[PDB]
Ligand binder design. Structure first.
Ligand SMILES: O=C(NCCCCCNC(=O)c1cccc(O)c1O)c1cccc(O)c1O
Ligand SMILES: [Fe+3]
Ligand code: NI
Ligand code: NI
Ligand code: NI
Ligand code: NI
Length: 278
């Protein structure tokens, strides 16, 4: 029983319950994990800590997030390839091999895109109720943090560290869920939305003077070398409220940077926010 999927990059006809599934989005991979859905191929080179089981030799290595092994993908001859924003530009290449669905998060409507992505997996795999149950759990999660949020005021800044440099995310960004969904107040509400974040210096941080400084150590997951500490915790940063209040919250980059938009990653993401402000 074939079905047709509409997505940002077009329309794909897909066999229901495809036998061989290749996944280039870790959110999706953690969602299929979460659902008991079996995958064939993953890019093992960038696997998140929490998805380390997909290193097993039962799974085919199809390369890296930025470096798909196209020849290997061909030899697998998958029934479905699922990609996201990091591979958007290779859509045609993938679609040439096998039916390819694109599943990205619209950051203007994080939760709505998330839900539709998940519901599309529900459809493809016959997992509609399991999906709805998980969507419901995250909804209650949100409301709770949404209450805890409104309890207090105090403004938040979201930063990312890569090689001693630091860049910022605000509403509508890849990390906007903090502001947009969970109801934390942004220290700067008009931050130019950018996939690796608006470049800034410490001069900027110790100015907007946030109560909460959410940090994402990019180097921990792209270099394998955590830098987040030393980049951040320096004189000019330490002057802030957040360092004095011990509210510099290092967010887990395995979830936040390599893998969001999945049943597991979004639940975990929300929990790191909750704990961050309790
Ligand atoms: O278009 C993208 N990157 C192209 C430029 C990347 C230049 C090199 N990057 C890395 O080495 C790297 C490796 C693994 C995961 C990443 O996100 C990385 O950026 C991109 C899109 C959505 C999210 C991202 O994050 C991206 O990057
Ligand atoms: Fe990146
Ligand atoms: Ni299941
Ligand atoms: Ni190869
Ligand atoms: Ni081969
Ligand atoms: Ni329902």
């Amino acid at each position: 029983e074939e079905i047709t999927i509409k997505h940002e990059l077009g329309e794909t006809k897909v066999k229901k319950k495809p036998e061989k599934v290749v996944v280039f989005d870790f959110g999706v991979l953690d969602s299929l994990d979460k659902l008991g859905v079996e995958v064939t191929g993953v890019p093992k080179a960038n696997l998140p800590s929490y998805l380390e089981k997909y290193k097993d030799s039962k799974y085919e290595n199809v390369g890296g997030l930025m470096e798909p092994d196209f020849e290997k993908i061909n030899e697998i001859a998958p029934d479905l390839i699922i990609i996201s924003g990091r591979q958007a530009n290779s859509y045609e290449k993938f679609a040439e091999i096998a039916p390819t669905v694109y599943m990205g998060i619209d950051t203007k409507n994080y939760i709505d895109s998330f839900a539709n992505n998940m519901k599309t997996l529900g459809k493809i795999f016959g997992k509609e109720k399991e999906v709805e149950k998980e969507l419901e759990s995250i909804n209650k999660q949100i409301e709770a943090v949404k209450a805890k949020a409104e309890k207090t005021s105090g403004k938040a800044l979201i930063v990312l560290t890569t090689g001693g440099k630091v860049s910022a995310y605000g509403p509508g960004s890849r990390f906007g869920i903090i502001h947009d969904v969970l109801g934390i107040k942004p220290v700067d509400a008009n931050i130019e939305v950018s996939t690796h974040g608006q470049s800034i210096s410490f001069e900027y941080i110790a100015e907007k003077n946030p109560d909460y400084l959410f940090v994402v150590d990019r180097d921990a997951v792209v270099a394998g070398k955590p830098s987040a500490k030393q980049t951040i915790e320096n004189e000019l940063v330490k002057k802030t409220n957040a360092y004095k209040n011990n509210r510099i919250i290092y967010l887990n980059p395995n979830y936040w940077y390599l893998a969001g938009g999945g049943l597991i990653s979004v639940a975990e993401m929300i929990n790191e926010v909750e704990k961050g402000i309790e």
